[PDB]
Structures are given as C-alpha cells and as structure tokens.
Ligand binder design. Structure first.
Ligand SMILES: [Mg+2]
Length: 95
RNA sequence: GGCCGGCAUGGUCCCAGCCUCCUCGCUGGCGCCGGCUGGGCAACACCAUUGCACUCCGGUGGUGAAUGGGAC
C-alpha cells in the first residue's frame, strides 16, 4: 500500500559508500530547485544507510521532486523516492 | 599501537627513497626468527545490509610493514 503525500520525501537505494556530509550536500544540490528545504537527514547506520529524508517546506515541492527525480542516476545508482510514511518532527513543530 | 626472547650486526652523521589502523615525519621506522598483549572502527579495505527516521551505535582485517648511496 503506497503512501499519502507528505512534506518529506523518503529516498533509498542511495550509494552507501558516500559520507553523510557530502551526501547531504550533493542531495541539496539537485533538490533545492523543487522548493525550499527545511532539512535533509542522513544516517549511515546499519538500519538507516542508503536512505535519506529530504524535508520540503511545501508539499507541492516534495510532490514535484518526487515525480521529476524518480530513478535519477546519483552516484551511479537509480534514486528511489517515496513520500515519508509520517510527518518529520520539524513539520509537527508547526503544522 | 605496546612487549619479550633468540640470533646476527664496527661507529656517527649526510642525501635520496620506502613503510605504517593506533602521536604521517625529517630529535617515527625501514637485520633475521619466535612468541605475548591493548585500544579503536576515526580513516582505508572487506563482509553483511534495500532499510521509514527524527537517540550516537552492524562485523572483521592491516606492523604477517619498508632500502640504497655518500662523508668522515
Ligand atoms: Mg562500519
């Protein structure tokens, strides 16, 4: 069962060999155009490696971002995107 | 990274080179053999991982390393 639209896009199948700092930057480099970005969260832990949460300020941005970049080659691997299953705290602390 | 034993080995500097998970270099180290033992995944490598978070957090490996020339 797919997910409902969200301010945060969840991406996976990301090249795990990239360090956290560089990955956040490289990601912001290709997604900042779809709209303001509140934050990007990356973890290289066993459970969270290869994944990232790009938190957009406006749902439309995430939505665009989702349709446009789906499957985009990044660090030699086809990005896989979805909407986050739930709101990120940064969002809750507001709407 | 640290430690011990055995054997071998004239000396002190100089230049160049090379070595390394553990005070990366010129007031580290760069004969041979055997064994004892600590830290840490930070980097690098390999294994495993396709994983939905907002709590930092998988594992194993490396020193089982590296030479020549010159001056007294
Ligand atoms: Mg690791």
């Amino acid at each position: 069962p797919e997910t409902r639209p969200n301010h945060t896009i969840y991406i996976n199948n990301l090249n795990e060999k990239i360090k956290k700092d560089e990955l956040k930057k490289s990601l912001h480099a290709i997604f900042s155009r779809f709209g303001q970005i509140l934050d990007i969260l990356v973890s290289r832990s066993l459970k969270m490696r290869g994944q990232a949460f790009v938190i957009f300020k406006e749902v439309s941005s995430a939505t665009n971002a989702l349709r446009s970049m789906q499957g985009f080659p990044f660090y030699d691997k086809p990005m896989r995107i979805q909407y986050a299953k739930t709101d990120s705290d940064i969002i809750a602390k507001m709407k």
